[PDB]
């Protein structure tokens, strides 16, 4: 894994020692080359994981996420170029360094073979994200959003640290391979119940769960474009990755303990999709849609069936791409009109035609038009839940309908109608923004042709 | 082009609007022209019957009862002119309408394709830029101390002065832009 | 009816609007920047028709038949055809034959 890690680390000295003109160019070029290197990890032996070393391993679950992060870094730099132009060279380099540290931490989290190291790196991501949000946000609420994000995540995580240390003491090892191979069943005792809660709750917080999702809207709304992109695409997926990894330890109690979170996620998906219908801010609407899709992912993980896990992996990747693209599309309008109110900018299809097509494709993926990977994941999850209970179809179908409604309502309001007369600052879309949208869309559409890559280990 | 509205509708204006609505809905019910003409003459006679009522209370009660009759007798699907609000073609060409300010963002190569037009556009821009100050001064002068109490805007008092706040009305997108 | 100010304002706006509309009219010159295809009289009658036929139907048909060669042989059961109906008639492979009793009463 050092083939990827070491170059990512060298990205920092290059960025710091690069000329003021050339920071973005060098960062983008070398990040893209690193992403190209990451594509080698997609080749996964079916039976066994790629155990590169004692510290690091990759499987059919970690590989797609690593590729996603490496891909995301250059898109994040491209998106963040515009609003950081006025910033001084040192601050721009610090922002790029925060992004690079975040990528390094995420890669090590995904490839780490020990749960304690995974915890250290997974919590470590808070610092760069917190710094980004609270230093390069454009609103007074960036500080409160940072406090909420940090404290929600830490309150979830710390009991996880206690539980992991206890597991290390009892089983004797926190290496995932040994844990999987031995994996003695849990007993239905209050102590084991609370251990299950401690293990699950941190990832339940990271993956916005209904009742623990309040941090996500504030953080995504108040964060800069790059921070929103990472939070939606990758940081949420850390919870899913950990929950899929951690579920091995808690085999039997999961059936008994799943019902509260299963019900919360299933009803919350409807609740948040309905929330999206009446939201007045584009970023907030995108965030709530993210919440709903991650609720679908949570249901898939809790059910603990192979098809559900494959759907969860596919949905994680597809949603990361789609939500990042949606945030970037909203950010372009925000830069042009300097407001996140949906009503303020209208009829943008006439003014900016190609951005309208980008919006259409992003919304279609959001509403799971087949054969999109979004639909593949959602359909697999839906079938697994149908096996879990035939009555599940009602809520899932209602959620599908509400998702289509809110996605196309966003598209109609922002990109359709008569243009807002007074707004005169709309200017022809730059090649950079269209290139960012295309870089988002094309990999998602291409991944449909070969869907085994994003279908996870159980495939 | 719409005239500024008044605070209230006069009794005569309300009666006229009721007359127009009744005639149009009758035409909707009376599809054939001859029947429409006969019943329309009937309606005109109906209005003429109380045209000259002296008591305003009685006339107001008559208008109220006539409106109730209209609501009972309104055609469920009244004819709407194709381009009128509620019509089949209302706002159909809205997307094709594009604001004038967009042309400023054209690439120089694109503006080269239509040189004379952009020269004329520069002339119009000069006219607006010169006229703005005098228009603001005139609007300030004519405006009452409390403030503008109606949406109506004054015409140009002196030669060489354009009507105040004229740009958007004059340069509004064409009805059928294509 | 119109107030005098309303009439004057509307007439001035009419003049300005008509001037703007006339200005929007294009001149006799609309400079288009100035032959990648050297086919000046391309037989409009048939060359386009045959070229379209070949490009749209003939090439795809060749490609699809070659793909039929690839896919049928590579994988069993890729193409499955409903078994042809067999009436009291001869069969090519085994040259078998049969008749349907014919004891049926002919009159109807």
């Amino acid at each position: 894994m050092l083939k990827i890690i070491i170059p990512t680390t060298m990205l920092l000295p290059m960025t710091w020692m690069s000329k003021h003109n050339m920071i973005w160019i060098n960062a983008t070029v070398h990040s893209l080359l690193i992403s190209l290197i990451s594509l080698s990890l997609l080749n996964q032996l079916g039976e066994n994981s790629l155990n590169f070393s004692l510290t690091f391993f990759s499987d059919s679950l970690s590989a797609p996420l690593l590729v996603l992060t490496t891909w995301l870094l250059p898109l994040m730099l491209m998106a963040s170029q515009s609003h950081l132009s006025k910033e001084t060279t040192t601050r721009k380099k610090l922002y790029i360094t925060m992004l690079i540290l975040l990528q390094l931490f995420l890669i090590m989290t995904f490839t780490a073979t020990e749960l304690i190291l995974f915890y250290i790196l997974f919590e470590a991501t808070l610092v760069p994200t917190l710094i980004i949000i609270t230093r390069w946000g454009n609103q007074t609420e960036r500080l409160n959003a940072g406090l909420y994000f940090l404290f929600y995540t830490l309150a979830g995580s710390l009991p996880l640290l206690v539980a992991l240390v206890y597991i290390q003491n009892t089983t004797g090892s926190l290496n995932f391979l040994i844990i999987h191979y031995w994996s003695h069943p849990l007993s239905n005792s209050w102590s084991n119940i609370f251990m299950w809660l401690a293990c699950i709750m941190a990832f339940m917080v990271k993956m916005p769960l209904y009742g623990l999702h309040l941090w996500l809207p504030k953080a995504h709304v108040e964060a800069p474009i790059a921070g929103s992109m990472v939070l939606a695409a990758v940081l949420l997926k850390l919870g899913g990755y950990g929950m899929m990894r951690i579920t091995t330890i808690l085999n039997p109690l999961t059936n008994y303990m799943a019902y509260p979170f299963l019900m919360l996620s299933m009803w919350g998906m409807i609740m948040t999709s309905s929330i999206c219908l009446r939201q007045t801010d584009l970023k907030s609407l995108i965030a709530y849609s993210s919440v709903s899709h991650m609720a679908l992912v949570i249901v898939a993980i809790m059910i603990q069936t192979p098809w559900s896990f494959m759907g969860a992996t596919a949905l994680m990747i597809a949603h990361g791409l789609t939500s990042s693209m949606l945030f970037c599309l909203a950010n372009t309008n925000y830069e042009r009109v300097h407001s996140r109110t949906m009503i303020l900018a209208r009829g943008l299809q006439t003014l900016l035609p190609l951005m309208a097509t980008w919006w259409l494709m992003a919304s279609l993926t959001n509403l799971a038009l087949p054969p999109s990977i979004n639909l593949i994941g959602e359909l697999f999850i839906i079938t697994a839940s149908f096996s879990w209970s035939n009555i599940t179809i009602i809520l899932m179908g209602m959620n599908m309908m509400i998702t289509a409604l809110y996605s196309l309502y966003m598209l109609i309001t922002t990109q359709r109608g008569k243009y807002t007369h007074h707004i005169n600052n709309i200017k022809a879309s730059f090649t950079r923004e269209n290139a960012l949208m295309a870089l988002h869309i094309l990999p998602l559409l291409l991944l449909t042709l070969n869907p085994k890559m994003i279908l996870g280990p159980l495939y | 082009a719409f005239s500024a509205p008044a605070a209230y509708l006069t009794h005569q204006q309300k009666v006229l609007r009721l007359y127009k609505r009744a005639l149009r809905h009758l035409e909707s019910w009376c599809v054939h022209r001859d029947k429409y003409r006969y019943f329309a003459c009937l309606m005109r006679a109906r209005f003429d019957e109380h045209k000259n009522e002296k008591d305003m209370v009685k006339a107001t009660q008559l208008l109220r009862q006539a409106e109730e009759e209209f609501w009972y007798g309104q055609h469920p699907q009244p004819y709407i002119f194709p381009e009128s609000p509620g019509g089949t073609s209302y706002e159909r060409y809205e997307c094709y309408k594009v604001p004038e300010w967009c042309l400023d963002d054209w690439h120089p190569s694109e503006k080269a394709m239509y040189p004379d037009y952009f020269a004329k556009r520069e002339q119009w821009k000069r006219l607006r830029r010169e006229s703005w100050e005098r228009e603001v001064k005139q609007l300030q002068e004519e405006t009452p101390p409390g403030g503008p109490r109606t949406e109506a805007l004054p015409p140009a008092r002196k030669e060489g002065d354009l009507p105040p706040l004229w740009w958007h009305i004059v340069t509004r997108p064409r009805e059928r832009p294509m | 009816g119109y107030t005098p100010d309303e009439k004057l304002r509307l007439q001035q706006l009419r003049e300005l609007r008509r001037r703007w509309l006339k200005d929007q009219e294009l001149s006799p010159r609309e400079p288009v920047l100035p032959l990648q295809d050297g086919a000046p009289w391309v037989i409009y009658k048939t060359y386009r028709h045959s070229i379209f036929a070949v490009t749209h139907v003939l090439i795809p048909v060749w490609i699809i038949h070659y793909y039929l060669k690839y896919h049928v042989t590579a994988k069993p059961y890729t193409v499955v055809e409903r078994k042809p109906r067999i009436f009291p008639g001869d069969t090519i492979l085994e040259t078998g034959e049969v008749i349907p009793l014919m004891k049926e009463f002919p009159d109807q």
Binding site: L351, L352 | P177 | -
Partner: peptide, 12 residues
């Protein structure tokens, strides 16, 4: 009677 068509810049 050709009339200029007001459309957004398509060059970019």
């Amino acid at each position: 009677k050709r009339l200029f068509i007001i459309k957004p810049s398509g060059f970019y």
